């Protein structure tokens, strides 16, 4: 029931987007962060600050423990949880319960943060990234298999200035214009090939390999647009020249009373036909974020992450079955009756290498 899945997300890019899920027998209601950048389903399993409730396994008659635990480290944060299996229902979209793996967190650090409204995480990336190993069936693999849905999901985030997670399909009401598809280069993260970044129509002076150092990924669980340091510095220099040192490093807010003074930022992606590319473009409203304002781009060590900053401009189709990611401008991506994103193409890729991925 894809229509019942519209508006099933609450929250925003800073505190993440989250889905209501019902777990165990009788069901316990939890609020679960949608993370296309990881592959484990995990919930709080004990009281903690910054959460109101947790999943108590002793109260579910269908819970079964797998008899082991797992630690998951991210760059910022980590958790250790017992691994078990239980029945889950997603009230908005499905008529039935499904058996899934579930990790219940008994220790964490810098994972549950102040201001968050979620108490668990739904990892929608591929088997490759599941811990302790790829044999721990992912939530979406369980769902596709047990709910008879196509191997596709899609996401509209509406909180620039909730949203929708469509499990099994694409909802036409959630985008305007055409959908453009870029190939998934490797099935772990949603890794896609970036060919070029432009700032106000000016291309940066960088080999396309730099944008894929060592991967460009689409990740709903990352707040900002994160760029490898060398790309970040080039971006910052272009955005500054076309317009507070602490502001670029996010260590400071910037205040007025603003947007007309800043350039559009374009990311070129290779089309499914390799001789063509398209571009997704964010306007200043997406990256000069009202909070006074914060800079919505930050440095990364080894990944270009198309986080919520950019996804809030787009309907994003994670088409696993056809190994491609789709993008279309989002109707909800407007601020004060003005679109804050664009998509266009085709452009020729004749002057770019046939593979920008190292």
């Amino acid at each position, epitope marked *: 029931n894809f229509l019942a899945m519209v508006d099933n997300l609450q929250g925003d890019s800073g505190r993440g987007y989250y889905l209501e899920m019902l777990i165990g027998t009788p069901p316990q209601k939890l609020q679960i962060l949608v993370d296309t950048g990881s592959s484990n389903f995990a919930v709080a399993g004990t009281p903690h600050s910054y959460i109101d409730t947790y999943f108590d396994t002793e109260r579910s008659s*269908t819970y*079964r423990s*797998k008899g*082991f635990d797992v630690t998951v480290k991210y760059t910022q944060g980590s958790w250790t949880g017992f691994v078990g*299996e239980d*029945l889950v229902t997603i009230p908005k979209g499905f008529n039935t*319960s*499904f*058996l*899934v*793996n579930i990790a219940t967190i008994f220790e964490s650090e810098n994972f549950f943060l102040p201001g968050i409204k979620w108490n668990g995480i739904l990892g929608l990336a*591929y*088997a490759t990234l*599941a811990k302790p190993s*790829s*044999s*721990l*069936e*992912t939530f979406f*693999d*369980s769902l596709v*298999t*047990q*709910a*008879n849905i196509p191997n596709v999901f899609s996401m509209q985030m509406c909180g620039a200035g909730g949203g929708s997670l469509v499990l099994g399909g694409i909802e036409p009401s959630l985008y305007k214009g055409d959908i453009w598809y870029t190939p998934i280069k490797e099935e772990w993260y949603y890794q896609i090939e970036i060919l070029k970044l432009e700032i106000g129509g000016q291309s940066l002076n960088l080999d396309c390999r730099e944008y894929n150092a060592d991967k460009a990924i689409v990740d709903s669980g990352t707040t900002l647009l994160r760029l490898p340091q060398k790309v970040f510095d080039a971006v910052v220099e272009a955005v500054a020249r076309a317009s507070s040192d602490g502001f670029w490093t996010g260590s400071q807010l910037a205040c007025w009373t603003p947007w007309s003074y800043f350039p559009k930022i374009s990311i070129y992606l290779r089309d499914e036909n390799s001789s063509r590319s398209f571009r997704i473009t964010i306007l200043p409203q997406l990256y000069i974020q009202p909070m006074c304002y914060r800079f919505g781009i930050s440095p990364s060590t080894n990944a270009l992450v198309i986080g919520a900053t950019v996804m809030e401009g787009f309907y994003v189709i994670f088409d696993r079955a056809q190994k491609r990611v789709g993008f279309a401008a989002s109707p909800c991506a407007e601020i004060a009756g003005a679109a804050v994103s664009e998509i266009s193409g085709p452009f020729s890729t004749e002057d770019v290498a046939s593979n920008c991925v190292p």
Partner: nanobody, 112 residues
Framework: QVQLQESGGGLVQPGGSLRLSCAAS????????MTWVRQAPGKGREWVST????????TYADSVKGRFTISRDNARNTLYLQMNSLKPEDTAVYYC?????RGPGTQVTVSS
């Protein structure tokens, strides 16, 4: 390498019965949720039954409830599907599946 290998299909009569097996290697089978899915000619994929790693939780599609029995022998790394009161519309390839992977399948043909 993870391997799954179904067997035991073939031709049966309406009202007949079969035991399917799925042999698993290359992963810790006794820790895996295991699923049977089938694909009938001219139809999309249809989930049949799921069984939790320890065998105690089993779920079934309404179309097979009360006719089919899923089970597993963890010590032999074997998943089973025992099917009673077979119907022509049970004609399908049956696959065992775990963690995105599936075996080559086994064909059940139910013919009048």
């Amino acid at each position: 390498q993870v391997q799954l290998q179904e067997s035991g299909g073939g031709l049966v009569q309406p009202g007949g019965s079969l035991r399917l097996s799925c042999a698993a290697s290359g992963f810790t089978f006794s820790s895996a949720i295991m699923t049977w899915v089938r694909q009938a000619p001219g139809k999309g994929r249809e989930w049949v039954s799921t069984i939790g790693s320890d065998g105690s939780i089993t779920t079934y599609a309404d179309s097979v409830k009360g006719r089919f029995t899923i089970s597993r022998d963890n010590a032999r790394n074997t998943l089973y599907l025992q099917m009673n009161s077979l119907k022509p519309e049970d004609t399908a390839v049956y696959y065992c599946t775990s963690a995105g992977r599936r075996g080559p399948g086994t064909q059940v043909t139910v013919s009048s």
